[PDB]
Amino acid sequence: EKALDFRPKLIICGGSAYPRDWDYKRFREIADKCGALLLCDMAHTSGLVAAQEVNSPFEYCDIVTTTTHKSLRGPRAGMIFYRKGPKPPKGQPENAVY
Amino acid sequence: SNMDPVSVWGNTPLATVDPEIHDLIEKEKHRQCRGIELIASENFTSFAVIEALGSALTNKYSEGMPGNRYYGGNEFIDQIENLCRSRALQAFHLDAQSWGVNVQPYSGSPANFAAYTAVLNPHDRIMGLDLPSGGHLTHGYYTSGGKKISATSIYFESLPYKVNSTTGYIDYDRLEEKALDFRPKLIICGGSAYPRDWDYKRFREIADKCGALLLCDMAHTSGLVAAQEVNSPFEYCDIVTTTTHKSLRGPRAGMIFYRKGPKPPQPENAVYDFEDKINFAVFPSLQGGPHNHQIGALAVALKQAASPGFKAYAKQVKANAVALGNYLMGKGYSLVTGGTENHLVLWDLRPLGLTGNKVEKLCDLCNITVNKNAVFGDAPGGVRIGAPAMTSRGLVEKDFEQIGEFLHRAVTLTLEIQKEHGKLLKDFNKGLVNNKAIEDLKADVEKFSATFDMPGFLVSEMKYKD
Amino acid sequence: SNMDPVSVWGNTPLATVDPEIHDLIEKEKHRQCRGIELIASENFTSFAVIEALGSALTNKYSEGMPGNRYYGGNEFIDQIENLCRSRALQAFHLDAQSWGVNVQPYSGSPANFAAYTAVLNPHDRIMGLDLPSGGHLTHGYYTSGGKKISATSIYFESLPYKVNSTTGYIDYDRLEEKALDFRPKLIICGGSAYPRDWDYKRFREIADKCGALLLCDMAHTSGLVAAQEVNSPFEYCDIVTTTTHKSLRGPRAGMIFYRKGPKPPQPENAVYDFEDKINFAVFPSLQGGPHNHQIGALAVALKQAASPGFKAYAKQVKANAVALGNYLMGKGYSLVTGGTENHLVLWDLRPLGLTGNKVEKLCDLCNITVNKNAVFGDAPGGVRIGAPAMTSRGLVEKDFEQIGEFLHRAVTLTLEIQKEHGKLLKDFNKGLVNNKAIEDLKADVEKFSATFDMPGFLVSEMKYKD
Amino acid sequence: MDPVSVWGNTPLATVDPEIHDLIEKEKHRQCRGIELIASENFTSFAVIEALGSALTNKYSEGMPGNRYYGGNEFI
Numbered sequence A: 001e002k003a004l005d006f007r008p009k010l011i012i013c014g015g016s017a018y019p020r021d022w023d024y025k026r027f028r029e030i031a032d033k034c035g036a037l038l039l040c041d042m043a044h045t046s047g048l049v050a051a052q053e054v055n056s057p058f059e060y061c062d063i064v065t066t067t068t069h070k071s072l073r074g075p076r077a078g079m080i081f082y083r084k085g086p087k088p089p090k091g092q093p094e095n096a097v098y
Numbered sequence B, C: 001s002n003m004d005p006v007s008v009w010g011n012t013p014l015a016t017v018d019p020e021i022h023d024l025i026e027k028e029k030h031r032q033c034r035g036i037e038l039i040a041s042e043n044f045t046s047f048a049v050i051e052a053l054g055s056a057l058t059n060k061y062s063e064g065m066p067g068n069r070y071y072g073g074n075e076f077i078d079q080i081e082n083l084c085r086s087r088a089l090q091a092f093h094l095d096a097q098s099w100g101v102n103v104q105p106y107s108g109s110p111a112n113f114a115a116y117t118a119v120l121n122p123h124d125r126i127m128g129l130d131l132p133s134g135g136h137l138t139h140g141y142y143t144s145g146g147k148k149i150s151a152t153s154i155y156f157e158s159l160p161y162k163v164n165s166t167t168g169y170i171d172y173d174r175l176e177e178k179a180l181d182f183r184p185k186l187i188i189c190g191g192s193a194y195p196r197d198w199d200y201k202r203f204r205e206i207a208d209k210c211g212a213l214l215l216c217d218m219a220h221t222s223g224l225v226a227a228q229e230v231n232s233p234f235e236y237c238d239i240v241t242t243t244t245h246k247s248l249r250g251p252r253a254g255m256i257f258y259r260k261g262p263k264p265p266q267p268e269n270a271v272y273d274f275e276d277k278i279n280f281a282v283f284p285s286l287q288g289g290p291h292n293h294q295i296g297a298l299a300v301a302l303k304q305a306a307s308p309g310f311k312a313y314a315k316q317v318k319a320n321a322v323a324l325g326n327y328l329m330g331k332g333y334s335l336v337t338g339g340t341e342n343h344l345v346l347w348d349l350r351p352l353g354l355t356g357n358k359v360e361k362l363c364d365l366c367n368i369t370v371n372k373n374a375v376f377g378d379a380p381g382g383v384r385i386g387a388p389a390m391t392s393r394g395l396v397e398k399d400f401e402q403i404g405e406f407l408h409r410a411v412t413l414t415l416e417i418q419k420e421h422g423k424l425l426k427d428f429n430k431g432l433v434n435n436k437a438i439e440d441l442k443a444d445v446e447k448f449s450a451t452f453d454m455p456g457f458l459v460s461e462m463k464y465k466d
Numbered sequence D: 001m002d003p004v005s006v007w008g009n010t011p012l013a014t015v016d017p018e019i020h021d022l023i024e025k026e027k028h029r030q031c032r033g034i035e036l037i038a039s040e041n042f043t044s045f046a047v048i049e050a051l052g053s054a055l056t057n058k059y060s061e062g063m064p065g066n067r068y069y070g071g072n073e074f075i
C-alpha cells in the first residue's frame, strides 16, 4: 500500500535487526506493481546466504549489496552485485537488457 | 507612411475594429444565456465587475506593494489596491491585526504556487487531497507511472491523502497516520470536487502533531465562506488561498490570506512571519506587475460579496445543490457521500455502467455543461455539477429540480444510445448524429434557459436574440 | 432574506454599484491623459482591446487546448483561441509548419516560468542578462549575499552575463567564455533596459558551441519585432516568450512561441519536441483555466499589430526615442551606449552626482513618470525612459524634444534642491514641499499633455475634465 | 452492495410500480364508493405519517423505563 502511494524508484530489503527470513518473491511482486528497482542489503546474513542457509536475494533482486565483515567473516569492505545480460520477460520491449 | 489617428485605431469600438472577435463574443454571450451552466467552478459575474475589468486600469504598471512601489504614477492604483485588501479582510470577517491579505495573484494556481514559494524550500514535503478523492491539480499530482504532472509535484515532494473508501468523507485517521510517516512541511485542505464541509479543527490537530503548516485552498467555496454558510478555514489555518471567480462571483484572480501577530502557545511572544515572505514570493519572486484592472474589479466583487443579498445568494446556492441532489437520488442515482453540504454534487455513474465521458458529451450537445470527474477508486466514473452559475441567474429549488429532470432525460438517452450503438466511444458517437431525442432535449433546455435573467450584459442589447 | 434581483446586483453600472472604485478609476483615467507617461514597459491600449477584455469571456472555464479540452461549452472559446494563435503567427511572419504558439500565459513572468518548466528540470543551469546590465528579474537574480530573489534562481541554477564595461553593449566574448565554463542548459536573451539590438546570430553560435537551448524574451520590443523594425529572434532562437502589453500595445498577457518540425543538422530527420512540453507546462502543470477575456483581447491586439498603421507606429516609437536621446545628449547628459536602437533610452545620472531615486521622485511630482534603473557597476544610478506610451497618444519627434526639455528642467531642479538641501533623501525631501518651480513644471507638463488624443476611452466622456 | 440511496431512499412509485399502482387503485376505490362497513373508518394523514416512519426500525421489548436493552430514550 505505501509503495503504490509513494511510488519509490527503489525499494530496499534486508535489515539489521530482523530475526526472520525475507519473502523476496513478494518484494519482487510489489516492486513490479509499483515500477521500482529492488535492492537487497544482505550485510547481516551474507554468510548464511553464501552457505545457502537462508533465502537467496539473487533470485528476485536487481542489485545486492553487502558488507564483508559480518556473517561473511572477512575484512571490513563492501561489495555491490548487479544483474547483467538480457532482462527476463516483463510492458517491456523485446531485446531489453540490464 | 503615417500612424493611424488615435480615433481610428484607439477609440473605435470593437464591433468595427474586429468584427470577427466581436461576433464570436456575441455568440458566446448567447451560449451563456441559452443553456444550463453546471460547471461547478463557473459563475456569471456582475456588470460592475466587468466594467472595472475592462478599464484604463489595464495600462498601469505598478510593481511592488502600495506605499512601497518601484516607481511612481501610483496615487490611485495604491488606493484601489488598499481598498481591495481592506474589503477582502471585511468580506471574510477578519481582524487586520490577526490577518493580512495579498491581492495580486493572477489566478488561483499562481496564488497557490506563490504561497508554497513563500513558506517552503524546493523539494519540501506537501500533502493535499488526492485528485480521485476530489482534490485539485495544484495540491500535487503524479501518475501511477511516476510522471510528475502538477508543478507542485515537480518542485516540491507531494503525497496525497484520500477519502474513506466507504463514506466518501476525508479519512482523517489515515491522513494523520500518513502525515506522521511522511512528515510534510505543509498540509493542504480544501478541494475541487469534495461535496462536504471540512473539519479544520481536526486538520489543525494533525498539523500540530506532525509539525506542519496548514493551508486551506477555499477557491470553490470562498463565497460560501464569506457568507458564513460553511466552516471558516481562518479559525484554524495558517494560510488561506482562493480564486475569486467561482462562488465568490468576482473576476478571475487570486488572493493569499495569512496570519499576523502572536502565535498560539516555542519562544514566548513569538509571532508569525508570513506577511513579508508571501508578499515577496508574489513579487519580485514569481510575478511581474499586478493586473490592476483585475484588482479593481476584485474590489468591486468584495463589496458586493459583503451585502445581505450575497448572504442570501450563498444560502440559495446550497439550497439549490441539495434540491438537485435530492431529485437525482429520487430517480435512483448515486451521489458521492449521499448528498452535499456546499455548492456541488458529485454523481457516481459507475452503478449505471456509464462513464463521465459519455454523459458530459451527450448533454454538452443539449447545451447542458457539466464536467466528467474522477471518483474514488477509478475514463472518469462520475460527473461534477455545481449550482453557483445558475443560482446567479435567479434560479431556485424548483428550477433546480427541473434541471434534475433534464439531467435524468440526458442520462436516460445516454443509456439508450450506449445500449443500441455500444460502449466504445467510436461506437457510442454513432448515436449522437441526427438524434431527434437529443434535438428535442436541447430545444427544451434552450426554452427553459431563455426565461431567466442574465447578469453582466443586457440580453436586450445582444446581437443574437433568437 | 431574498436574493437581490439580477438587475440590481448584476446589470447595474459600476458608477452606481461601487461609486468609490468608479471614482478612483476616473481619477486614474485623468492622471493618464494629464501627465507624460515615460515608463518604458507601459502603453495605452485600444478601446477595442478593452471592450474584449471587459466581456462575458471572463465567465468561461476552458482548461486544456482547443480541440482537446477537459469539458464542454467551448465552441466559441475554441475559435477565439484558435484565431488568437493564428494571428500571433501572422503578426510575427511565422510559418505554422516551423512555429507554434501558446497564448494562455497569464502574463510575461508566467510565460517565462512555463517555458523553463517545459524544457528544464529543477536545478538545471540558466544564464540571462544581469539586472544591472539591463536584464529582467525572471532571467535570474540573486544578491551579493547569496539570497535567491527571482523564482528562476530559486528553482533553477542561474548565472548572469553582463554588458561590456566600456561600451554598454552585450559582452559576447565574455558570455561565450562563461557559457563554456558554466554549461547552461538554457541561455536567455532579451532584456528590460538594454537600449541596443541583439546579435541573435552570435547567441546561436554560443549556444551551439556549449550545447544550450536559446530562448529570447522579447517582451519589451515585441511590437518592434512584429513591425520588422528590429532583428527577429525567430531566425535563431528555439523559444520566444513575450508579454503583450508593452510595445505590442495589447492586454496584459503572455505568449510562448516554439519551433516545430525538422531540426537543423544528431539523428537524421530529427525534429523539435517543444510543442507538447510547452503546452503541458502551461496546463496542467502551472496554470488552471485560461483567462479567455485576455485571449480575446489579445486576438484583437494581434490584428491591430498586423496593420500598416502599426508598422508606422513602431517606426515612430524608434524615431521618438532617438529624438529624445539626441536632445538629452545635446544638453550634456550621458546615455548608456550613447544612443538607442529601440524604444528606450537609459540615462546614466552618476556623472551629474545624482541618483535615479531623486530624479524619479521629483518628476513624479511633476506628473512625469520614469523609473529609476540600475546601471552598470552600481541607489540606482540612472533612469530608464520609454517612447511607446506617448507615441501611442500621437506624439512625434518634436513633441519628444519638448519632453526632453521638461526632463532637462526637472533634472536642473533636482540638482538645485540637492545642492540647497542635501544629498540624504531625508534632507532632499525638504526641497519638495511647496516648491514653486515644481508646481510650475507640473503645470506646464499638464497643459502639454492635455493637448493630445487618448486611446482606450473618450476624454469627452470622463468624469474629471478639468 | 447497492448504494444505500438506490434501494433505501427511492420512492415506492419507482421501487415497486405494481404495488404503488395497486395502492393508487385502492385509494381510488376508497373515494368513489359508499363505505358502510361499521368497523371501517378513514384515518388522518397525520396518523399515517407517524405510522410510516423510522419508528418501525426500533426494537423496544419490555416497558418504558423497564426495557430489555438500550436506545429507548425517545421510544
Ligand SMILES: Cc1ncc(COP(=O)(O)O)c(CNCC(=O)O)c1O
Residues within 6 Å of the ligand: B061, B287, B288, B289, B290, C040, C041, C107, C108, C109, C110, C112, C136, C138, C190, C191, C192, C217, C218, C219, C220, C243, C252, C253
Ligand atoms: C523583459 C521582460 N520579461 C518579462 C516581464 C514580465 O512581464 P509581466 O509584468 O507581465 O509579468 C517583464 C516586465 N518588465 C517590467 C518593466 O521592465 O518595467 C519584462 O521587462
Ligand SMILES: Cc1ncc(COP(=O)(O)O)c(CNCC(=O)O)c1O
Residues within 6 Å of the ligand: B040, B041, B107, B108, B109, B110, B112, B136, B138, B190, B191, B192, B217, B218, B219, B220, B243, B252, B253, C061, C287, C288, C289, C290
Ligand atoms: C480548489 C482550486 N484551487 C485552485 C484552482 C485554480 O484556479 P485558476 O484556474 O484560477 O488557476 C482551482 C481551479 N479548479 C477548476 C475546476 O475545479 O473546475 C481549484 O478548483
